[PDB]
Structures are given as structure tokens and as C-alpha cells.
Design a protein around this ligand. Structure first.
Ligand SMILES: COc1ccc(C(=O)NC2CCC2)cc1-c1cc(C(C)=O)n2cccnc12
Ligand code: NA
Ligand code: NA
Length: 114
């Protein structure tokens, strides 16, 4: 059993995960691979956690989905230094999400949806 909003969020999540072929954003970061992570980053987030929330119908809106997506990217831009692959990939993914899920793009989706 699924709903229109779950199918829409699954589509955005799939498109964003395509930009992360190696799965750096696929599951939670552990301190063993990222020293000090859990001290620096107080509110972890990852694409696997977001998928689970979609399945449990925990997002009321695209705005709520975007807030978890932005948190994930911000954590990576805060913890990692700028010359690292994780910092650079976080910027690429976040730029893609801004364009995919902007207020303007959603407006048009709604009108067509009416
Ligand atoms: C779930 O997180 C990961 C999973 C797998 C890998 C990984 O396979 N990295 C290889 C490229 C050289 C090792 C890295 C990460 C990873 C993500 C991140 C993030 C998102 O900050 N990170 C930061 C420092 C070190 N490793 C990571
Ligand atoms: Na945080
Ligand atoms: Na799209």
C-alpha cells in the first residue's frame, strides 16, 4: 500500500541517490571512519534513514523531506575539510536538490496536479 506523497518523495530520493554511486550518503557515518564525528555533528542524517521515514509515512510534506536532505548535506559541509571528496560531493548533491525541489518547481507541479 502506498500513497501519492510517498511515490513523489521516493522519486526525489532516487534521483538524488544517483548522484552518490559509491554510497557515501547511504547509511549513518561511524566515528571509526570519521574521527570525532559524533561529537561535532549533533543531529546525523543519511539517505537510508530518509528512505525508512518515507516507508513509515513520517513526512507530512515535501518541506519536511527537504529539511532532512538539507541537514544531511550541511553536516557533511561542516565536518569535512574543503579539499575532501565528502565536502565536494555534498555541494554537488545539495545544488542538485535546490534545483529539483525549489518552491518554484513545486508551484508548477501543483498547478498541473490540480
Ligand atoms: C556512510 O559513510 C561512508 C561510507 C563509505 C565510505 C567509503 O567507502 N569511502 C571510501 C572512499 C575511500 C574510502 C565513506 C563514508 C563516509 C561518509 C562521510 C560523510 C557523509 O561525511 N565520511 C566522512 C569521512 C570519512 N568517511 C565518510
Ligand atoms: Na547536526
Ligand atoms: Na525530478
Amino acid at each position: 500500500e502506498s500513497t501519492p506523497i510517498q511515490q513523489l518523495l521516493e522519486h526525489f530520493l532516487r534521483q538524488l541517490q544517483r548522484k552518490d554511486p559509491h554510497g557515501f550518503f547511504a547509511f549513518p557515518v561511524t566515528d571509526a571512519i570519521a574521527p570525532g564525528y559524533s561529537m561535532i555533528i549533533k543531529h546525523p542524517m543519511d539517505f537510508g534513514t530518509m528512505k525508512d521515514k518515507i516507508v513509515a509515512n513520517e513526512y507530512k510534506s515535501v518541506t519536511e523531506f527537504k529539511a532532512d536532505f538539507k541537514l544531511m548535506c550541511d553536516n557533511a559541509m561542516t565536518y569535512n575539510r574543503p579539499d575532501t571528496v565528502y565536502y565536494k560531493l555534498a555541494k554537488k548533491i545539495l545544488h542538485a536538490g535546490f534545483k529539483m525541489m525549489s518552491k518554484e518547481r513545486l508551484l508548477a507541479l501543483k498547478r498541473s496536479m490540480s
